[PDB]
Design a protein around this nucleic acid. Structure first.
Lengths: 78, 93, 108, 96, 96, 80, 108, 93
DNA sequence: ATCGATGTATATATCTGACACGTGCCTGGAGACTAGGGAGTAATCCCCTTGGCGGTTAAAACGCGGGGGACAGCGCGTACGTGCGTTTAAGCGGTGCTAGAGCTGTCTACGACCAATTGAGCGGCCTCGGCACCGGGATTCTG
DNA sequence: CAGAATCCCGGTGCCGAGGCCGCTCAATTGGTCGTAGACAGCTCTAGCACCGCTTAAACGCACGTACGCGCTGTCCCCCGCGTTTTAACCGCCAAGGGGATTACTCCCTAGTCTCCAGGCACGTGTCAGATATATACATCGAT
């Protein structure tokens, strides 16, 4: 159970970059679940591309293609 | 000119699923659009999968992977079994 | 010369394997098309077609009708948690909407 | 003694983190989470050093935008404290 | 005389129009609006009988969806009456 | 011209009723008219662009289907 | 056998017309590619490149820097109403957000 | 082995716009991916336009129409203007 | 009106590794010619789009009575922010191992291209029963 | 608890869906042959594991003030019902602009061969940016 590694201070820092001034005490457990749901949908696609190529090493391009398929084009990693 | 359509095949399937039921012309037009939609989506992903691996030929593995990427979990789970059974019987014939 | 037998009859499918193979060649998706591709794609399209028509027919029966109409296709797709995900961005002509009212709006 | 009034440090932090560009989540704890999630799909997988960085950049870029949307739907209710129902409304209207 | 209390008829109308399927905008006024807007792009255009029906179906579907989103924004503020700021918030979150 | 006034108040109410709205503020009508006009303008610009590329003079249902498809919304029942 | 000279020099462009022509033929977009397609596409790509670099270079001077970095590209894109519409879905690594605080949150 | 990128042409443009400024390798990578993205968008739409009209070839008319569909109102006018200028200079050389 | 304790920024000097440039060479772009079928032009058919009249009821526009909803003001009590002292484990610098990504060589099984044959499925026609409209009766639900 | 709204049942009747026929052009069977890719072996990059150390960051506690929430009052703007009127909808008649097709032929692009220069790895070195120190001056909270 490594979800606890996303600490409360880190969530507050993310909220500050987003402009949030005051934060309620229940936001932390809601945010952990949202992030956990987001990661799984990207990793499943990356692993699918890795398996089609019969490789054993997940590669940056697999992630780039997984994100582009969802409409989240990322510039910078080739 | 002559226009092709899937109407006869959709009707054969309907007669297999519900012999007593019929279908109106508008419903047939909708079904005829749905089939072309999914056809173009699968052929598109199979094409992308081929270029990323420098392969020159589309094969059943490209179709199976495109199906696993496009359809939700249970639908993909069943469709893969249907395609595998069809290809196995065709090759054994 | 042997008597011809259709590829669909060999595979046991209703959809046309020959037409699918022709469309795969004419669309320029790739320079070569393997012999197994059209049988697999035809089997998948047939599965999804029957999967939709069954729910549409059940809706038509509940309404006490005998002919399927677009209203029944809308009711079939929007009541299934998986079909609605695959067809979320699609609008069907004459489909209407599902009955729904917010509980806050109903009288005490 | 000396003590600042509630909210001045929060505004100073807002002005701080909107100027910088570094990553805010700890690298090693995030990497262990990525390793734990991938194990449900395939065993003995290996990850390139840049794959974890691409995943971290994508996740932080997603969460910042979600908080930006949540703050507007908090202000709309004439509040300043963000609450779970604001996240739920933003996600419902976004269709996710 | 017998009179229904405020809101009793509104629920009945909601049920009526949710159960029906016909189009709700007048055909001739919409057709004239379509021919007026097009005149800005090219002169002496002609339209097929089915293009106007396609445009009308698309516009009515869009407006019904926008009202569905706006009603959630109204309830979030504990109100019953929808107001322009609810539309502006829904459109802002949708990214229109 | 005045043709935008052809989208009368009763039509907007019927649309709001289908969406489940129980009570409507009197300022919603002009806002809805402004929201609708930009949508029509965006779809029609693309439709006319496809019509001009084909050198046709009549606008057909396919030009509309392709325009909507490009905007990211798919219409079933008119062709394609 | 006259001395060879590049097509880009004839057109007056910096981008490679030959490489673009090759990439079109290798993509299977169509069975035939005309002579004018690569010159037009190269000119379009050169235009959009020069516009992006001009705005990024202006943003560099406003920070007394002499080298362009991703932050300057992000500020250049997000401050222009045309470029921001074209690149609305793109995420740029190390770009960060623009400074913005709602007026309701500032002190009374 | 040997890679292929636009970094030469991007640098040539940079020295024309701002002869006193340089660019970091991280920014060059983003500029390199930007061109590949827009190239794929335009070539895609041009192929669809050719298929709908039942034509076998791609010409400047398909590129011009794709540009007018993809680029916003102000970018489109300038891009079309210099695309036609380039083609006219090439054909008149 | 202002004090004074904190905080952010600027100005100077020292360092280091990221950037710009030059060299060698090889593989991919340019020049010259041939063959052939895709696109351009002109002519014909005919269909479906635009324009008009008459007329009847479905639908929109205008008034008004009143009540129930939106909004401002007040009290209160406890949830969150600011600041300190403690303790956990992230980050870094170094060394070593070996799994597996990337490449060259051989060759044989696969798919593309032609030709002759015929039957699958598309267009035109017939018809009859599923649906819809009218009118009267039964049940529900609200003020 | 009177009475206004919705549903359903029996009768009429029509034009949309189900089935038949003619027939032609798209799919099948048989053959050749060229090269795409499956398999075997090798090199050596970079992903994984372990250790010691410093100290940046996370954790736990106290406290007090600013916010969220519930209650009360009032006034005005939506809803429901009735009358008048205006322009939507249906049906019938004209005509001609433009879409869709056929036949001809020419000029554009694909393909093969030669050959030579553009641009890709590799190596070098020097100055733009990062850091430590000192200090200027701006802001916030209480008197």
């Amino acid at each position: 159970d490594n979800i606890q590694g996303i600490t409360k201070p880190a969530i507050r820092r993310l909220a500050r970059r987003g402009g949030v001034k005051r934060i309620s005490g229940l936001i932390y457990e809601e945010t952990r679940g949202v992030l956990k749901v987001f990661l799984e949908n990207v990793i499943r696609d990356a692993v699918t591309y890795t398996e089609h190529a019969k490789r054993k090493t997940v590669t940056a391009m697999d992630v780039v293609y997984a994100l582009k398929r969802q409409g989240r084009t990322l510039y910078g990693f080739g | 000119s002559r226009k092709e359509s899937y109407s006869i095949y959709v009707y054969k399937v309907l007669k297999q699923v519900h012999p007593d039921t019929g279908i109106s012309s508008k419903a047939m037009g909708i079904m005829n659009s749905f089939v072309n939609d999914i056809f173009e989506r699968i052929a598109g992903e199979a094409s992308r999968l081929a270029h990323y691996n420098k392969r020159s030929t589309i094969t059943s593995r490209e179709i199976q992977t495109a199906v696993r990427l496009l359809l939700p979990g249970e639908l993909a789970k069943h469709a893969v079994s249907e395609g595998t059974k069809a290809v196995t019987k065709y090759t054994s014939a | 010369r042997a008597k011809a037998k259709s590829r669909s009859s060999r595979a046991g499918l209703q959809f046309p394997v020959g037409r699918v193979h022709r469309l795969l060649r004419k669309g320029h998706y790739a320079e070569r098309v393997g012999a197994g591709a059209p049988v697999y794609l035809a089997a998948v399209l047939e599965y999804l077609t029957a999967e939709i028509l069954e729910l549409a027919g059940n809706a038509a029966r509940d309404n006490k009708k005998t002919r399927i109409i677009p209203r029944h296709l809308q009711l079939a797709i929007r009541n299934d948690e998986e079909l609605n995900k695959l067809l979320g961005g699609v609008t069907i002509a004459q489909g209407g909407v599902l009955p729904n009212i917010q509980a806050v709006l109903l009288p005490k | 003694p000396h003590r600042y009034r509630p909210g001045t440090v929060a505004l100073r932090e807002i002005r701080r983190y909107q100027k910088s560009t570094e990553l805010l989540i700890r690298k090693l704890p995030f990497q262990r989470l990525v390793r734990e999630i991938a194990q449900d799909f395939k065993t003995d997988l290996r990850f390139q050093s840049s794959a974890v960085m691409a995943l971290q950049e994508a996740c932080e870029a997603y969460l910042v935008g979600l908080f930006e949307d949540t703050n507007l739907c908090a202000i709309h209710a004439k509040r300043v404290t963000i609450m779970p129902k604001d996240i739920q409304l933003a996600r419902r209207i976004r269709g996710e």
